[PDB]
Design a protein around this ligand. Structure first.
Ligand SMILES: *[C@@H]1O[C@H](CO)[C@@H](O[C@@H]2O[C@H](CO)[C@@H](O)[C@H](O)[C@H]2NC(C)=O)[C@H](O)[C@H]1NC(C)=O
Ligand SMILES: *[C@@H]1O[C@H](CO)[C@@H](O[C@@H]2O[C@H](CO)[C@@H](O)[C@H](O)[C@H]2NC(C)=O)[C@H](O)[C@H]1NC(C)=O
Ligand SMILES: *[C@@H]1O[C@H](CO)[C@@H](O[C@@H]2O[C@H](CO)[C@@H](O)[C@H](O)[C@H]2NC(C)=O)[C@H](O)[C@H]1NC(C)=O
Ligand SMILES: *[C@@H]1O[C@H](CO)[C@@H](O)[C@H](O)[C@H]1NC(C)=O
Ligand SMILES: *[C@@H]1O[C@H](CO)[C@@H](O)[C@H](O)[C@H]1NC(C)=O
Ligand SMILES: *[C@@H]1O[C@H](CO)[C@@H](O)[C@H](O)[C@H]1NC(C)=O
Ligand SMILES: *[C@@H]1O[C@H](CO)[C@@H](O)[C@H](O)[C@H]1NC(C)=O
Ligand SMILES: *[C@@H]1O[C@H](CO)[C@@H](O)[C@H](O)[C@H]1NC(C)=O
Ligand SMILES: *[C@@H]1O[C@H](CO)[C@@H](O)[C@H](O)[C@H]1NC(C)=O
Ligand SMILES: *[C@@H]1O[C@H](CO)[C@@H](O)[C@H](O)[C@H]1NC(C)=O
Ligand SMILES: *[C@@H]1O[C@H](CO)[C@@H](O)[C@H](O)[C@H]1NC(C)=O
Ligand SMILES: *[C@@H]1O[C@H](CO)[C@@H](O)[C@H](O)[C@H]1NC(C)=O
Lengths: 407, 116, 186
């Protein structure tokens, strides 16, 4: 049986969306020329499909963020008073002094990630939601969680002190509420220390988002570099061929260049769709994780951080989202002799809620996740059956507190 | 003279022996906003990346938007322009461009001895 | 698009294959036929790849629908915001052309009132905690009630359990506990 506990804080990194890219078929393939455009026209439509695919990808990229973050009906604002039962929500809540409405951890996150081609017909669209709105959304979620609990998600937000909210979470995971109220200072100090450790470790990781950015950067660079290959033509510059050869000869040279560039563009588009599918799956997982761990408690194991889950707070990262799970893990232990049932007068006495333990001389009944021995009484136990059916049963007595009263 | 993309961008004059630069002319995509063809025939062209110094006028981070007025207020998004701007038709009617509104803001009276 | 792609020259002299067959000697028409072969093969490959990519997403959506059907319909789920907004009660399925439509019945509260609370009440120097509810006071008296509905009830020795003494509790107030056994004893 554990006799203590430690509060742990973890982090998880989940990419949400990527860059919205636009590519022009005609300017890339041919450019300023008109003979090349006329030749390309004979290929039916190998531009409309590419434009449609890229526009669909961009719309999906916007939808991922809209689904992940826009989960709150009203933008709550934290009250000025900071009497959160001893807890320190100052490295997470926004600081208006900074030019942006971000917080310390968010600022460390954006400073950690570091993010010509436009002349070739490759352009990058801007995100639909600028980072200020995302910061406002996350601040609203934090304020709702802190000042209301999980009630704000279900309906209208309901105020409640933070101490009783933490007591509700404790009672949810299987530890009676008196444990929190008796050990409030220790838990507050442990949580503050965990937040401090997270902040210190982050300053001095973010591999997922960096790799997501690097993949697109390398893909665009490869697409740009593919424009220099001859593909079997005499020269890789269309103007050079046009000014140096007759149209009847220049046509057959331009055909090979057109085929090569069209093939490269097809490859790039296919890779982009394959990557966007995976990003969509990750964004859906992130939305589910937010809606489950943040807006309420979770009974799923290992879903929201290792250990038993208490509460979580979201943070915003460039092209991603960060969760700070707060968990409850057991601590220093002790051996204990145990027994299934207690035999009193030919009647078994199963424990109503808890276990039967004994250090070697006296028997006690106590909860599973914390150690607080109590005397066996009629309120802790219920009788059922005889003393022969149970495989292992230990003789002892039961207090029955009614007898002293009648004296 | 070349660059990372390996395209001729700097040339030396064969006559005067001086250094020049090469830069392709400005270009970008064109996007149109329409409130539908059942209420009006009005539109509002949006140039993708051209600065408004080049070829009503409302310079945005997303690009130049002409044909639509700009207002102080903030309503729910109707047309996803980009960079936190959304246009709409309802203002005798004209297109307007504004900033997104996240939603109504409320503050809950949180005190250490109060419940709901 | 796949059908309309059949009407392009692809570099040959004509689009329909019959004209190529009739107008030219096959030893010269072989290259003209080869051009169309290449173009149409490329178009078919593009269409097939797009279809596979779309089928993956439809499969994922169908798996999600199956999970929601198995969890919301065949029982009650405690996963927040999964089986509809609000607390979840029960769901019914309906059919649709190439899809499924659910009807989530949800329980949502309204018309809230505010109150004053205390973490615990101590009567004779020992702190009492609520077993399953929360202590609320309307201004003169203290009652214990469940945390999702307002049904005040007089605080007794059956709504509370003692734990230690009322000095460690950061917030504590004075009150009385009914102790129903004593009045019946007399
Ligand atoms: C449970 O563990 C905590 C540590 O988190 C113990 O609290 C520390 O106790 C030592 C010894 O008295 C003090 O020096 C520390 O200041 C305490 N706090 C911390 C944060 O270390 C606590 O004593 C343990 N429980 C029991 C019953 O001993
Ligand atoms: C097992 O725990 C019980 C707790 O009740 C211990 O009982 C105590 O024993 C000492 C020594 O005889 C008495 O002075 C105390 O009054 C007893 N009660 C309490 C609450 O301390 C018992 O000693 C423990 N077993 C062993 C082997 O130490
Ligand atoms: C809080 O609720 C109690 C419920 O008992 C109210 O006390 C009752 O008030 C009415 C009207 O004055 C009396 O007729 C009853 O006899 C009272 N019950 C008692 C004293 O047990 C109390 O007034 C309420 N507080 C308010 C409304 O401020
Ligand atoms: C919270 O911690 C910061 C430093 O981490 C400190 O400056 C601030 O005073 C603390 N707040 C409270 C209420 O103790
Ligand atoms: C419990 O008993 C086992 C068996 O001897 C021992 O290995 C273990 O260390 C004991 N627990 C503690 C906390 O000492
Ligand atoms: C319990 O007591 C009964 C009667 O006193 C006896 O028959 C039985 O063997 C005892 N069991 C143990 C484990 O002492
Ligand atoms: C145009 O759209 C509006 C919007 O509902 C509709 O009321 C109207 O009947 C439509 N007109 C035609 C000709 O379809
Ligand atoms: C457009 O050009 C003007 C004039 O130089 C400049 O002040 C402005 O910043 C430019 N627009 C952008 C978005 O930089
Ligand atoms: C916003 O308000 C300011 C202050 O009067 C005004 O100068 C500006 O023109 C307004 N923006 C509009 C009308 O788009
Ligand atoms: C909270 O309750 C007090 C009385 O207990 C009342 O004066 C105040 O107006 C209430 N605040 C609300 C309902 O926001
Ligand atoms: C609640 O906060 C007030 C300050 O507004 C303070 O006087 C009071 O002691 C606090 N009570 C508890 C139980 O935290
Ligand atoms: C009422 O509560 C106060 C708070 O400490 C305490 O000092 C006082 O003794 C309590 N009343 C009685 C009758 O014990």
């Amino acid at each position: 049986i554990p006799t203590n506990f430690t509060i742990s804080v973890t982090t998880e990194i989940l990419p949400v969306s990527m860059t919205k890219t636009s590519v022009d078929c005609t300017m890339y393939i041919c450019g300023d020329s008109t003979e090349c455009s006329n030749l390309l026209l004979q290929y039916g439509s190998f531009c409309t499909q590419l434009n449609r695919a890229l526009t669909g990808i961009a719309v999906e990229q916007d939808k991922n963020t809209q689904e992940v973050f826009a989960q709150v009906k009203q933008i709550y604002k934290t009250p000025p008073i900071k009497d959160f039962g001893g807890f320190n929500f100052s490295q997470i809540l926004p600081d208006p002094s900074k030019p942006s409405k971000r917080s310390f951890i968010e600022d460390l996150l954006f400073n950690k990630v570091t993010l010509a081609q436009k002349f070739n017909g490759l352009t990058v669209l801007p995100p639909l939601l600028t980072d200020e709105m995302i910061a406002q959304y996350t601040s609203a979620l934090l304020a709702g969680t802190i000042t209301s609990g999980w009630t704000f998600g279900a309906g209208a937000a309901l105020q409640i002190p933070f101490a009783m909210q933490m007591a509700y979470r404790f009672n949810g995971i299987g530890v009676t509420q008196n444990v929190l109220y008796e050990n409030q200072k220790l838990i507050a100090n442990q949580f503050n220390s965990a937040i401090g450790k997270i902040q210190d470790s982050l300053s001095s990781a973010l591999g997922k988002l960096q790799d997501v950015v690097n993949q697109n950067a390398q893909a665009l660079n490869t697409l740009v570099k593919q424009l220099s290959s001859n593909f079997g033509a005499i020269s890789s510059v269309l103007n050079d061929i046009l000014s140096r050869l007759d149209p009847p000869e220049a046509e057959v040279q331009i055909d090979r260049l057109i085929t090569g560039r069209l093939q490269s563009l097809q490859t790039y588009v296919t890779q982009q769709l394959i990557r966007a599918a995976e990003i969509r799956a990750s964004a859906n997982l992130a939305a589910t994780k937010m809606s489950e761990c943040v807006l309420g408690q979770s009974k799923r194991v290992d879903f929201c951080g290792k250990g038993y889950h208490l509460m979580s707070f979201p943070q915003s990262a460039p092209h991603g989202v960060v969760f700070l799970h707060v968990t409850y893990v057991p601590a220093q232990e002790k051996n204990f002799t145990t027994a299934p049932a207690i035999c009193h007068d030919g009647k078994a006495h199963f424990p109503r809620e808890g276990v039967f333990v004994s250090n070697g001389t006296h028997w006690f009944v106590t909860q599973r996740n914390f150690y607080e021995p109590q005397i066996i009484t009629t309120d802790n136990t219920f009788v059922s059956g005889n003393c022969d059916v149970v495989i292992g049963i230990v003789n002892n007595t039961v207090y029955d507190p009614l007898q002293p009263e009648l004296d | 003279g070349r660059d990372i993309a390996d395209t001729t961008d700097a040339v030396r004059d064969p006559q005067t022996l001086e250094i020049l630069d090469i830069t392709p002319c400005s270009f970008g995509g064109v996007s149109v906003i329409t409130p539908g063809t059942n209420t009006s025939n009005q539109v509002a062209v949006l140039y993708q990346g051209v600065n408004c110094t080049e070829v009503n006028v409302f310079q945005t981070r997303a690009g130049c938007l002409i044909g639509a007025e700009h207002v102080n207020n903030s309503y729910e998004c109707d047309i996803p322009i980009g960079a936190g701007i959304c246009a709409s038709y309802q203002t005798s009617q004209s297109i307007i461009a504004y900033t997104m509104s996240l939603g109504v803001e409320n503050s809950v009276a949180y005190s250490n001895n109060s419940i709901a």
